[PDB]
C-alpha cells in the first residue's frame, strides 16, 4: 500500500515564500536534517521550482523505530528523534523564532496572519501540490473538497512547471 515518497512544505505571506523539507512515511513533518529555501514572493517559477525539487531531494522515507508486529516497507529508514513529540514542538518553535527575527515581526500573530500553506508530496506516480484552508493562525487544513483542488503534476515535470504549479495551488488556498 505505502510506497516511497518525498515531502516538502510551503509557507507564504506578504514578505516571503518559505520552502522546507518534510520527511516521514504516512505523516510528514519538518525535518531538522532537511533544507530550507527562503525567497521574495516574486521568485521565478524556475528557481521556485528548483527550490521545491532541492527540498524534496533531502526528504527522508522514515519511521520512528522498527516494527515487527506488522509489514513495513523494505526501503524505510528510522529516526526516533524526528518523531519525538517534544523535539517536534521545539524545532517548530525554533523554525518560528528564526522567521520572526529574520523579518522583524516581534509577534507571532503578525507572522501567521497572512500566511497560506501548501503541501508537496512526490512519488513514482505523480507530484501532488495540495492547498489548505487557514483555519487558525498556526493551523491549516482541508479546503475542503474531495480533494479536487490539488495541483497534480507529472513526475517528469520541469522545475518551471513545478514552480508554476505551486503558484496555482497558492491561489487556490482558502
Amino acid at each position: 500500500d505505502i510506497v516511497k515518497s518525498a515531502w516538502a512544505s510551503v509557507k507564504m505571506n506578504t514578505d516571503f515564500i518559505c520552502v522546507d523539507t518534510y520527511s516521514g512515511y504516512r505523516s510528514n513533518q519538518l525535518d531538522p536534517l532537511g533544507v530550507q529555501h527562503l525567497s521574495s514572493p516574486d521568485v521565478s517559477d524556475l528557481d521556485l521550482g528548483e527550490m521545491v525539487k532541492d527540498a524534496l531531494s533531502h526528504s527522508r522515507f522514515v519511521l520512528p523505530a522498527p516494527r515487527t508486529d506488522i509489514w513495513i516497507h523494505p526501503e524505510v529508514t528510522f529516526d526516533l528523534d524526528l518523531y519525538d513529540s517534544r523535539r517536534t514542538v521545539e524545532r517548530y518553535d525554533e523554525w518560528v523564532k528564526k522567521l520572526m527575527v529574520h523579518y522583524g515581526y516581534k509577534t507571532k500573530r503578525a507572522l501567521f496572519k497572512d500566511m497560506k500553506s501548501c503541501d508537496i508530496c512526490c512519488n513514482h506516480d505523480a507530484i501532488t501540490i495540495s492547498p489548505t484552508r487557514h483555519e487558525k493562525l498556526e493551523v491549516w487544513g482541508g479546503t475542503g473538497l474531495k480533494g479536487s483542488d490539488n495541483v497534480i503534476l507529472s513526475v517528469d515535470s520541469s522545475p518551471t512547471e513545478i514552480g508554476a504549479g505551486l503558484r496555482l495551488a497558492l491561489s487556490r488556498c482558502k
Partner: protein
C-alpha cells in the same frame, strides 16, 4: 498517569502527535491508525448531569474524528488519505450513572456507524 499518556503506553513509539492536533492524539506512523484520547473525570461527569450532555460531548469529538480531512500544525502534516482506522479511547469514572451509560453506549453506536471505534475504559 494522565489518560492521554496512558493511552500511549499501549501504542508504538513515535505515535504521539504534538499537542492540540485537532482531536487526534496518537498516530500509528506505519499502519495509519489514529487514536483520540478523551477522558471524563468525576467532576465533569457530575457536571454533565442533564440528559444528552454526555452524549453531546462525545458526539462532538466523534464528528471531528470522522469529518477530518487534513490538519497541518506545529510543523506536522496529516490528512485523511493517511488514516486507515479511527478510534476514540474514552475514560469514564465510577460515578457514571446508568442514565449516563445510556448516553455513552449511544455515542458508541453513533460513532460506529460514523466509522469511528469508541472504546470505553472504566477508571478507578
Amino acid at each position: 498517569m494522565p489518560w492521554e499518556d496512558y493511552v500511549g503506553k499501549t501504542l508504538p513509539v513515535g505515535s504521539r502527535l504534538p499537542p492540540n492536533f485537532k482531536t487526534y492524539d496518537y498516530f500509528d506512523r506505519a499502519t495509519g491508525a489514529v487514536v483520540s484520547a478523551k477522558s471524563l473525570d468525576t467532576q465533569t461527569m457530575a457536571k454533565l448531569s442533564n440528559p444528552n450532555q454526555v452524549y453531546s460531548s462525545i458526539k462532538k469529538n466523534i464528528d471531528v474524528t470522522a469529518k477530518f480531512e487534513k490538519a497541518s500544525l506545529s510543523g506536522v502534516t496529516v490528512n485523511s488519505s493517511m488514516i486507515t482506522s479511527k478510534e476514540v479511547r474514552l475514560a469514564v469514572p465510577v460515578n457514571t450513572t446508568k442514565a449516563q451509560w445510556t448516553e455513552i453506549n449511544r455515542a458508541i453506536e453513533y460513532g460506529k456507524n460514523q466509522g469511528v471505534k469508541v472504546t470505553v475504559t472504566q477508571v478507578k
